[PDB]
Design a protein around this ligand. Structure first.
Ligand code: SF4
Ligand SMILES: [Zn+2]
Ligand SMILES: [Zn+2]
Ligand SMILES: [Zn+2]
Lengths: 753, 351
């Protein structure tokens, strides 16, 4: 389609169109012009992305001013989800209106995904992937490649030939999704990790993890071309908060100890080289004694060893690290650091330290100064940069210290260090956690937020729209909750507060077996497992908590019976096994015989994956999720959060569980073709009807309150049967599917007011 | 006040010479009590009627039975022409009870071989009455489905109170994408016609091969009941038909030639179709005031068709569902009936 929003042709690629999408686009364009933040509840059961991209692409190509687009995603899954999406929209744009587009946009994800050279592609850990892909094309290693080309130099070899041809202009015109990108770059032998890294400078739409927009050590290279004032899209950013908490930092003393020797390994390295080649190190001192050395304290084409844990290369200063200008001075105080840390390591009990409170306390037990403390990282960065070491795993820990040092040098009074003497789960053992953490998400949010007023945020499960403006203090404009329009059932929600014995079922009671509930839960599950066709998942408040249920159920005769009907797949903590298991679960659902999956709402499964009709027909939320299984980490954070913002733990608590509860459910529907059954299994959900995302609660009927299993099973029994009918009125869909180019013309001409 | 199959649009082509293999799930799933003795009994019950109902409209179409127990494909009745043999094979099973899961994969493949022998013209076609909510497939399926298509095997299933994607896929794929065949009942009464609608042929928008001449002949009755003998059952058949070519006796039937291998029907079997060939546009209801035709049914002869001004009764329903092409009126039940039993539009017949 190609219609108007009172100013713009809308090159809509899907002939059929949904009224909300226009109701959607109508509002965002309004917000698009007059700058704002102004999040939007958008039920992703429709195509929200098309509704987004439709407005955006023209708005970029219709108005002349903003030639760039910023679309930030929760994960590569979202990336690849959107990547194909635009591409076809973009492809539809060439098909229907010739070619006047000259638009290219792509997304950076990592090295590990994008390291195309098979060597580290075999290797697992991204830091090691970072380490060797650095060592592939590293300022020393590329100098090892150029100045002293030797067998010690291995590389992707692409970044050379990429540099040979790529870095003058882009590959021709494609928005090359990984599907297109991974192949296309392989043929011409590219590790596109650098293709995008150079292409940072080009694309007019970008997509990457919020980290790449928020993680300052990766969200550092922000350029005006890539940023200056263009449009910002935060998709499925309901969980943005926890991402900002990025500035997380806990201290594995065991790794820390290895750092000590790594520090000594550094200590030996600097001493041994200062024996051998100290002049350039003195020249580096002369590269230091000049001042900040902005020439190579900041500009390093393939060199930079330590990232910028500080904000995107801003929160620093210029006065030299005084004495530490001498690395031997510098090396020494680093030992003061770790030992201080090592000294602080073995506190008998848990101790929480505010930075400033700790600040002079550092000077107390060892007279160190904060001004050098920030300088460590760059001072470290050049230090290792000068000495082309063979490994970083030791030095990862090292830079983390500097990273810690920088961080603790950096911020205050919104952040805090706490050391539990151990992990109390297996308490009375030595494993103290010198945890220093972020507390306010907004602080890390502020900078990018400070930049551009074309900031837009939307999840399928934002609820309520207040906490985020509350928590982040940020200045929205409009926050409209989108009632999904349905001329039909199209899905089913349910609430099981009590079982057949009307016994309230819960999880807040304990992580344990009140044998009534779980024995009741075996029934609940199994009867559902019987009734539905293939495709069904359940969620649990916590992994080991789930473990209890399974183990006891395994003991009981419950499991085998469901084993008769469906196939069972658990969730694992490791991603590998999971990742394998999932596709199978897909295969069983896709194949005939029924299956079933179990996982945890806080789990990675709930965060990235999606569930269509066959893949998902019924879901189950065993219990109401919670986290005070864990420690003051939240509470201590709550302190600042509660003491500043008029929020109680419950405020955070009751919403955030829901923030994760429905977070699962949004995956259940992909297209308005799909449908499903959405049950809730906890007594407290009854009190919780009033925190849902609007379209959910609208889809939620009253009579479904505190259902037992018996009353529940009937409705699904029908709903399944009913929905399975080719319920195709094909006439009332005019209102709900907006007769194409006509009713949107018609009804919105009638909706002209 | 109307729900009409608007246009009788094959419009020119439907699949007459059929070869339908009926397959029934026989599993403990069939032993659930949504239906009175079970689904299974009503199934076999509703299956029985089907056979005549089938053979009535299809006196020219072979048919056979399959049950699905213990995750096994288990033919019960060789595909053949007599109804009774088929018909009796049910009752036998009807008393016996199902055991073990349904293995759909077993089902089709047993059919796939089973439907091989039939000639090209014979519509190679299968119908499924699934009862379970899942399957137990010994081998692949997505590959197996395709093999069917390679054999041009249409399929159609009668879903139980649910929908399962694979069969939903199966029908869709096997009916060249264009799908309507995944019907799953919501009410038992629906199942009644669900069989009945399966009776008729089934093209929609077809691809056209070389539909050839069908050789066949016609036999003739005999007289001497005493001279009994046979040539297909080798019994002493009191006296019956004779091949026009093989010129041998045969037990009375529309059977094939057990002597020189050709199809031998009378003609009525052909005639039995043609209403399937060119059916009739529905008789249309009349305006609440404009009819003004005779105060007596045309087809039938019922004085009413209105109410002669009865406030909210005469204006309630112009009981004058009437034909277009002949433009002559017709009674209520008549149009209900002339569209039902004998088609042969009387008004359109006589002009
Ligand atoms: S050079 Fe390119 S392909 Fe090789 S490891 Fe580095 S990013 Fe990956
Ligand atoms: Zn005989
Ligand atoms: Zn003969
Ligand atoms: Zn007529």
């Amino acid at each position: 389609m190609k219609f108007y929003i009172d100013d713009l042709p809308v090159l809509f690629p899907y002939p059929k169109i949904y009224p909300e999408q226009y109701n959607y686009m109508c509002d965002i364009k309004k917000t698009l012009d007059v700058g704002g933040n102004s999040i939007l509840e958008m039920p992703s059961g429709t195509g929200k992305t098309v509704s987004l991209l439709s407005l955006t692409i023209a708005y970029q190509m219709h108005y002349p001013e903003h030639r760039k687009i910023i679309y930030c995603s929760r994960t590569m899954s979202e990336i690849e989800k959107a990547l194909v999406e635009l591409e076809n929209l973009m492809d539809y744009r060439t098909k229907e209106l010739g070619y006047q587009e000259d638009f290219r946009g792509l997304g950076l994800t990592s090295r590990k995904n994008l390291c195309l050279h098979p060597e580290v592609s075999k290797e697992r850990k991204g830091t090691v992937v970072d380490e060797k892909c650095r060592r592939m094309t590293n300022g020393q290693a590329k100098r090892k490649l150029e100045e002293d080309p030797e067998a010690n130099v291995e590389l992707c070899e692409y970044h050379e030939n990429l540099y040979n041809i790529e870095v003058e202009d882009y590959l021709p015109k494609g928005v090359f999704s990984f599907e297109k990108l991974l192949k296309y770059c392989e043929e011409k032998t590219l590790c596109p990790y650098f293709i995008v890294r150079r292409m940072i400078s080009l694309c007019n739409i970008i997509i990457y993890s919020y980290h790449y927009l928020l993680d300052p050590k990766i969200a550092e290279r922000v350029s005006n071309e890539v940023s200056k004032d263009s449009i910002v899209i935060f998709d499925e950013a309901h969980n943005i908060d926890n991402v900002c908490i990025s500035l997380s930092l806990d201290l594995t003393t065991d790794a820390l100890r290895r750092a000590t020797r790594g520090a000594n390994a550094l200590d030996e390295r600097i001493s041994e080289v200062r024996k051998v080649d100290s002049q350039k190190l003195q020249d580096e001192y002369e590269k230091l004694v000049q001042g900040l050395h902005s020439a190579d304290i900041l500009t390093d084409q393939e060199e930079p060893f330590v990232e910028t844990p500080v904000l995107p290369q801003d929160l620093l200063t210029e006065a030299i690290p005084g004495n530490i200008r001498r690395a031997e001075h510098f090396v020494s105080f680093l030992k003061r650091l770790i030992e201080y840390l090592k000294t602080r390591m073995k506190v008998l009990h848990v101790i929480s330290e505010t930075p400033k409170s700790f600040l002079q306390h550092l000077k107390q037990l060892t007279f160190i100064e904060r001004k050098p403390l920030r300088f460590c990282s760059e001072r470290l960065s050049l230090l290792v940069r000068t000495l082309e070491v063979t490994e970083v795993e030791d030095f990862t820990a090292l830079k983390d210290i500097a990273t810690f040092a920088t961080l603790i040098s950096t911020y205050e009074e919104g952040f805090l260090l706490i050391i539990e003497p151990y992990e109390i789960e297996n308490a009375a053992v030595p494993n103290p956690i010198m945890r220093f953490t972020c507390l306010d998400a907004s602080i890390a949010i502020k900078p990018v937020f400070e930049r551009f007023s074309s900031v837009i945020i939307t999840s399928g499960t934002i609820s309520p729209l207040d906490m985020y403006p509350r928590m982040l203090n940020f200045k929205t404009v409009l926050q409209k909750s989108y009632a999904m329009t349905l001329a039909k059932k199209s899905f089913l929600p349910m609430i099981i507060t009590k079982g057949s014995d009307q016994v309230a079922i819960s999880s807040r009671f304990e992580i344990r077996n009140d044998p009534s509930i779980v024995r009741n839960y075996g029934s609940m599950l199994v009867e559902f497992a019987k009734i539905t066709p293939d495709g069904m998942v359940v969620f649990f408040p916590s992994y080991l908590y789930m473990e209890s249920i399974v183990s006891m159920w395994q003991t009981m005769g419950i499991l085998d019976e469901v084993w008769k009907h469906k196939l069972i797949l658990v969730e694992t903590p490791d991603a590998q096994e999971t990742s394998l298991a999932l596709e199978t679960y897909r295969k069983a659902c896709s194949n005939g015989r029924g299956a079933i999956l179990l996982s945890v709402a806080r789990g990675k499964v709930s965060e990235g994956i999606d569930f269509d009709h066959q893949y998902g027909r019924t879901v189950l939320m065993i219990g109401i999720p919670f986290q005070y299984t864990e420690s003051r980490i939240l509470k201590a954070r709550l302190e600042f959060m509660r003491e500043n913002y008029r929020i109680r733990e419950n405020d955070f608590l009751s919403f955030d569980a829901m923030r994760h509860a429905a977070q699962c459910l949004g995956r259940v529907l992909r297209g308005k073709d799909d449908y499903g059954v959405m049950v809730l299994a906890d007594r407290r959900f009854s009190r919780k009807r009033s925190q849902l995302p609007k379209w959910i609660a609208q889809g939620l009927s009253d009579a479904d309150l505190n259902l037992s299993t018996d009353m529940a099973i009937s409705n699904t029994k029908q709903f399944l049967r009913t929905m399975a009918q080719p319920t195709d009125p094909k006439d009332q869909e005019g209102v709900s599917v907006w007769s194409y180019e006509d009713l949107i013309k018609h009804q919105n001409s009638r909706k002209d007011q | 006040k109307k729900r009409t199959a608007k246009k009788n649009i094959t419009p020119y082509q439907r699949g007459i010479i059929r070869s339908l293999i009926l397959t029934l799930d026989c599993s403990e799933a069939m032993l659930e009590k949504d239906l009175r003795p079970n689904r299974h009994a009503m199934i076999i019950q509703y299956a029985i009627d089907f056979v005549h109902e089938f053979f009535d409209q299809n006196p020219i179409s072979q048919m056979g039975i399959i049950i699905m127990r213990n995750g096994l494909a288990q033919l019960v009745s060789q595909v053949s022409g007599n109804p009774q043999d088929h018909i009796d094979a049910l009752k036998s099973i009807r008393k016996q009870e199902p055991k073990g899961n349904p293995s759909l994969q077993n089902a089709l493949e047993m059919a796939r071989g089973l439907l091989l022998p039939v000639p090209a013209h014979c519509t190679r076609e299968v119908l499924i009455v699934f009862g379970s909510l899942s399957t137990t497939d010994p081998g692949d399926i997505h590959q197996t489905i395709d093999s069917l298509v390679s054999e041009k095997i249409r399929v159609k299933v009668l879903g139980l109170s649910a929908q399962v994607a694979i069969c939903k896929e199966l029908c869709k794929a096997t009916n060249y994408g264009d799908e309507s065949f995944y019907k799953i009942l919501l009410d038992e009464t629906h199942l009644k016609e669900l069989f009945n609608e399966a009776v008729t042929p089934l093209p929609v928008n077809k691809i056209n091969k070389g539909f050839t001449l069908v050789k066949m002949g016609f036999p003739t009755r005999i007289f001497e009941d005493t001279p009994t003998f046979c040539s297909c059952h080798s019994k002493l058949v009191y006296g019956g038909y004779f091949c026009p070519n093989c010129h041998s006796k045969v037990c009375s039937l529309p059977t094939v030639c057990p002597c020189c291998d050709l199809m031998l029907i009378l003609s009525t079997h052909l005639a039995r179709s043609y209403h399937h060939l060119m059916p009739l546009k529905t008789f249309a209801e009349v305006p609440t005031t404009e009819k003004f035709r005779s105060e007596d049914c045309f087809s039938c002869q019922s004085r009413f068709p209105x109410x002669x001004x009865x406030x909210x009764x005469x204006x309630x329903x112009x009981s004058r569902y009437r034909c277009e092409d002949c433009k002559q009126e017709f009674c209520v039940d008549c149009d209900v009936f002339i569209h039902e039993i004998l088609h042969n539009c009387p008004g359109c017949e006589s002009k």
